[PDB]
From Swiss-Prot, chain A:
This is Large ribosomal subunit protein eL37A. One of its GO terms (cellular component) is cytosol. GO terms for biological process: cleavage in ITS2 between 5.8S rRNA and LSU-rRNA of tricistronic rRNA transcript (SSU-rRNA, 5.8S rRNA, LSU-rRNA); cytoplasmic translation. It comes from the Eukaryota. Its cofactor is Zn(2+). One of its GO terms (molecular function) is structural constituent of ribosome. Component of the large ribosomal subunit (LSU). Mature yeast ribosomes consist of a small (40S) and a large (60S) subunit. The 40S small subunit contains 1 molecule of ribosomal RNA (18S rRNA) and 33 different proteins (encoded by 57 genes). The large 60S subunit contains 3 rRNA molecules (25S, 5.8S and 5S rRNA) and 46 different proteins (encoded by 81 genes). Zn(2+) binds at C18, C21, C33, C36. Present with 21800 molecules/cell in log phase SD medium.
UniProtKB/Swiss-Prot annotation, chain B:
Signal peptide: none annotated. This is Large ribosomal subunit protein uL23. Component of the large ribosomal subunit (LSU). Mature yeast ribosomes consist of a small (40S) and a large (60S) subunit. The 40S small subunit contains 1 molecule of ribosomal RNA (18S rRNA) and 33 different proteins (encoded by 57 genes). The large 60S subunit contains 3 rRNA molecules (25S, 5.8S and 5S rRNA) and 46 different proteins (encoded by 81 genes). uL23 is associated with the polypeptide exit tunnel. It comes from Saccharomyces cerevisiae (strain ATCC 204508 / S288c) (Baker's yeast). The chain holds residues 83 to 142 of 142 of the full protein. It comes from the Eukaryota. Belongs to the universal ribosomal protein uL23 family. Component of the ribosome, a large ribonucleoprotein complex responsible for the synthesis of proteins in the cell. The small ribosomal subunit (SSU) binds messenger RNAs (mRNAs) and translates the encoded message by selecting cognate aminoacyl-transfer RNA (tRNA) molecules. The large subunit (LSU) contains the ribosomal catalytic site termed the peptidyl transferase center (PTC), which catalyzes the formation of peptide bonds, thereby polymerizing the amino acids delivered by tRNAs into a polypeptide chain. It is found in: Cytoplasm.
Swiss-Prot record, chain C:
Pfam families: Ribosomal_L39. GO terms for biological process: cytoplasmic translation. The gene is RPL39. The keyword Cytoplasm applies. Component of the ribosome, a large ribonucleoprotein complex responsible for the synthesis of proteins in the cell. The small ribosomal subunit (SSU) binds messenger RNAs (mRNAs) and translates the encoded message by selecting cognate aminoacyl-transfer RNA (tRNA) molecules. The large subunit (LSU) contains the ribosomal catalytic site termed the peptidyl transferase center (PTC), which catalyzes the formation of peptide bonds, thereby polymerizing the amino acids delivered by tRNAs into a polypeptide chain. This is Large ribosomal subunit protein eL39. HAMAP family: Ribosomal_eL39. It comes from Saccharomyces cerevisiae (strain ATCC 204508 / S288c). Residues 1-21 are annotated as: Disordered.
From Swiss-Prot, chain D:
It is found in: Cytoplasm. Belongs to the universal ribosomal protein uL2 family. GO terms for cellular component: cytosol; cytosolic large ribosomal subunit. This is Large ribosomal subunit protein uL2A. GO terms for biological process: cytoplasmic translation; maintenance of translational fidelity; ribosomal large subunit biogenesis. The chain holds residues 2 to 102 of 254 of the full protein. The gene is RPL2A. The lineage of its organism: Eukaryota, Fungi, Dikarya, Ascomycota, Saccharomycotina.
Length: 85, 60, 50, 101, 119
RNA sequence: AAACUUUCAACAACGGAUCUCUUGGUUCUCGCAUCGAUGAAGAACGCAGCGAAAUGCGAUACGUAAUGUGAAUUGCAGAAUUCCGUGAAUCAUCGAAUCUUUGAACGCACAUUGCGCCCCUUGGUAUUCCAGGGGGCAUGCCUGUUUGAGCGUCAUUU
RNA sequence: UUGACCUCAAAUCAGGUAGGAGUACCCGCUGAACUUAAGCAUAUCAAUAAGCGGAGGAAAAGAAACCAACCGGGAUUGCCUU
RNA sequence: UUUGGGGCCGUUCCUUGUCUAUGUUCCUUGGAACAGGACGUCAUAGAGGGUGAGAAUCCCGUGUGGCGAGGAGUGCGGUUC
RNA sequence: GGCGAGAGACCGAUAGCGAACAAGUACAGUGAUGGAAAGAUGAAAAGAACUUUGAAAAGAGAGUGAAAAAGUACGUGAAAUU
RNA sequence: UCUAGUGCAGAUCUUGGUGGUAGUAGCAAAUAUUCAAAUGAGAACUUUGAAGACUGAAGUGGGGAAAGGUUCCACGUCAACAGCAGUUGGACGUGGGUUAGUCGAUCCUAAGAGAUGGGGAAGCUCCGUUUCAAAGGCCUGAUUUUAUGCAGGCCACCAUCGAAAGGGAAUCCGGUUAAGAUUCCGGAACCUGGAUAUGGAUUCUUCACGGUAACGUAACUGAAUGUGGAGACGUCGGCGCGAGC
RNA sequence: AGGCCAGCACCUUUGCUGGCUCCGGUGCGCUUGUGACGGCCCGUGAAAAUCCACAGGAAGGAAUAGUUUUCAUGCCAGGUCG
């Protein structure tokens, strides 16, 4: 009964949600995410996990500041305001 | 019966009602509606009348 | 379960607000390519995995 | 070939000692000044069974000479020791059973 | 309809607070009218008017504090320049134009003369 | 002889090839150098008069302000003084702001929307208790300040 | 006694600073095997991939403890070539 | 024998707005003319796109120059202390 | 790689980036990771009033349209198979 | 003329699609259904009533943990699903719904995990959890420039996380809804924390009396420090007693 | 209160009024809790928080008035998540 009845015995989550990635990879008994490396400082990445990088990298989100960075570089990082020509 | 921020608590609700509606409030029972919101059942003293102040507000 | 956590309940509420069909005025708008919802989710068929 | 049992035994996740019911480590009183220049009296208050150990233990109690305090020790009981029993530890102590000469 | 930032700027602080509480009460009225009714956009006009009011107030306070900290160093970390981490951590044109008096002498005595070559 | 099987054609079907398209991709070239403790990348949850998503945004929530244009948005509804004008608009531009809870994440924690300490202030007849609001408390290191410790050590006391 | 010094410390002390991300190129460490050898162990794949640390718009290098043996040249990088 | 520093206007660089010619004449077909035909125009503009079908000549643009606005700035040209 | 521009004896929706579309999406897996399919009505919705049969869906007429041999199971509409 | 991703019958080829087999195998465990009425276009199955049967309290009953997530309840409703059917449904559509001082989490620590100091490691990070560390806060106040210093005094564990079944402060009845209730309504209680007034008690023998005693009481000063108890505990046997049945 | 019954009323919100709700017995009975004992062990069968008491005697207080708030009564509040 290594198959079906054991799958019936299967009901306790090894993994739950993580607060840095939100992916349900936070091993409770180790206290680590299997995807971001929480609660470590760094973010978990590998150059064999190219797809993983591509999935979790810059630009898959809002870039709440970084789009405006390039706009602002174009305008030369200016202070002040307009003058009502 | 009010719909309420998830950041709020019973002291806040009681004081806010006393201010906005010029009433006194006996007790407060809150819950989280599974649409994500908070709901508050707010019981006053027997002095005031909830019907009166609700059809004063302009809902009924 | 009954004894649950607020995060779970939060995600559940969001799911419940997602689980309903398209608006037909969106079906009416200009240049529209949407006919139906395809992010639709039913407890019998697929689980959230949370 | 595998690593074998005697080698796994040294990491010891499951081979560690089951150290719950053990009343403490059965060490003698510390050798401070009273022991190495005179003697000092304590009292065997209670003999008990230590788990994993076939020899019993004797919760002895002394007094602190430096403070109003009652530092309790754990001795391994010898044959003849009983409750309420005065234990004399030190250098000029007398040679009877239970003493720490 | 709604409100106008220029006349708000002419108005004073307490006038703005009164405007704000009025708008908020009106918006609560509008939400009960909304649950009674099918549709109501006047609530959206109200929303953006409240937003502009709070914006104006913020600008007034920040300008007060700017002209308070004026002409001295150590102004705070939300009235300073935002430019970028690296540019803030960079040198100044002063600190980068600093020289040894030695190199200043060598400059002044032997600078790149502007010459030309035909005859 | 029919029926049935098979074959061919016409019409109808299943199905989605062929043809013709094309806001995409790929490759080459040119040019510029711009993330973050002043809190990033990312994540979660939430915001529209009527939306689930996408895109946008953060309780000032498909956006505010400011500037420019110059009268639209549009699926519906509504709005009109907003039209010879400090002014429409899912407009463009963008120099002032907001920037929920998190995250290098920084009061201590975290499978808890958990538990504290300090300052200012308000109420409850309250330095102490309770609650509300506002502001704060990470670590390592640098320079400097103040308070120090050590017969490590100097002098000078009587 | 009082005041210095030396060294070591503490403060929610005054001011600042580093951390993380991205990583095509760049500086370094670390470090394989499949493979080729018609086998295979040196060797080769490779002073490579993976892993780790750290930067910029370029980096690194760089004004010779150099090349040379000439009638001598003259920082560095790079292209052709050798 | 030889020397320094600031201002201004220009100029350079960046960003960027706006203006800058020519047929929608006739006939046939067609649902529609951008097609065919006839007659013409501009062209330092016949590149490209759009519009009911192959559109230089309908629209945006292109080409040509022009007129501005805000920034960087010592690169330098004149002027001033 | 990032930001912005231009080009091609390139691919033309089983091709070309995995992704021309609400694609790193739905979905699977405890998890690391894996990872799709799916473009075209018509110039314009003018997207079929009205009558009739039917419980209705739909049908037959009518009508729109240049064309329903264009009816959201929509450009054309092969074959297998029927 | 140039140039190629240039010609398919095959590759247990790839992707998609389609067939014959074939209206076939088969839809057969769990003792079992029937009569009428109503609805509706339409009833073997929906609803009601009547009958016959079953589970038979170690149950097909009533409530929960893990998990699931809104399936809960209602109204409408049958294109797809419910391997027949369908007027029904855990389906489709639209809404509504989960009320706590006393139930739990939160607190405690267990096995254990894991920072700091320090030490290793090229380095991601490893060891270790009181360690070769200068590792802190508790109380009375003293002043009445005045807030909180200075007066003292005290102590030295020396992070934190870890159980919704362990330990643990305290709530019961009746009623009520479409769906909730030890939560809401009514009534009747208890606990913690913080304020405070009266009564009561006690005292001129200044901090209580009685009792031979076991010990009793409406209360009836008591800091630092220290000792002790409860928390705090196996299993089986038979006996007694109690509660409910 | 709740439960069992009776009576009189009405489109109806619909009730309204009355009574009873008593006294016992048994048991190796079932389940469960508990008490005092016994038996078993080379097995003797968690910890901490928290609470209380005691020893001790710092300190503080009465008389024209004090001391006490572990006695009684009285006042306020009791969050967050499920």
């Amino acid at each position: 009964g290594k198959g079906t009845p054991s799958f019936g015995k299967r009901h306790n989550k090894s993994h739950t949600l993580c607060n840095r990635c939100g992916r349900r990879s936070f091993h409770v008994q180790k206290k680590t995410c299997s995807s971001c490396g929480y609660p470590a400082a760094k973010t978990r990445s590998y150059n064999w996990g190219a797809k993983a990088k591509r999935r979790h990298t810059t630009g898959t989100g809002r870039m709440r500041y970084l789009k405006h960075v390039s706009r602002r570089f174009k305008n030369g990082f200016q202070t002040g305001s307009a003058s009502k020509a | 019966v009010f719909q309420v921020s998830m950041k709020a608590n019973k002291y806040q609700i009681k004081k806010a009602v006393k201010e906005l509606y010029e009433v006194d409030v006996l007790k407060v029972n809150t819950l989280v509606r599974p649409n994500g919101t908070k709901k508050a059942y707010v019981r006053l003293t027997a002095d005031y009348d909830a019907l009166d102040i609700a059809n004063r507000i302009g809902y009924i | 379960a009954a004894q649950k956590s607020f995060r779970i309940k939060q995600k559940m509420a969001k799911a419940k607000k997602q689980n309903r069909p398209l608006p037909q005025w969106i079906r009416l708008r200009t240049n529209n390519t949407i006919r139906y919802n395809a992010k639709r989710r039913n407890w019998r068929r697929t689980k959230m995995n949370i | 070939g595998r690593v074998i049992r005697n080698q796994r035994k040294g990491a010891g996740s499951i081979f560690t000692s089951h150290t719950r019911l053990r009343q403490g480590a059965a060490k003698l009183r510390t050798l401070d000044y009273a022991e190495r220049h005179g003697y000092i009296r304590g009292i065997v208050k209670q003999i008990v069974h230590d788990s994993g150990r076939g020899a019993p233990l004797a919760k002895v109690v002394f007094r602190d000479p430096y403070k109003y305090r009652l530092r309790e020790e754990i001795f391994i009981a010898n044959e003849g020791v009983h409750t309420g029993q005065f234990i004399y530890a030190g250098k000029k102590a007398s040679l009877n059973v239970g003493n720490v000469l | 309809a709604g409100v106008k930032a220029y006349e708000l700027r002419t108005k004073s602080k307490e006038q703005l607070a009164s405007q704000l509480v009025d708008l908020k009460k009106e918006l609560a009225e509008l939400k009960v009218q909304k649950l009674s009714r099918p549709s109501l956009p006047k609530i959206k006009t109200v929303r953006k008017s409240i937003a502009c009011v709070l914006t104006v107030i913020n600008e007034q306070q920040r300008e007060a504090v700017r002209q308070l900290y004026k002409g001295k160093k150590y102004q705070p970390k939300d009235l300073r320049a935002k430019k970028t981490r690296a540019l803030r951590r960079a040198l100044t044109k002063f600190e980068a134009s600093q020289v040894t008096e030695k190199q200043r002498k060598k400059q002044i005595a032997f600078p790149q003369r502007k010459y030309a070559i035909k005859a």
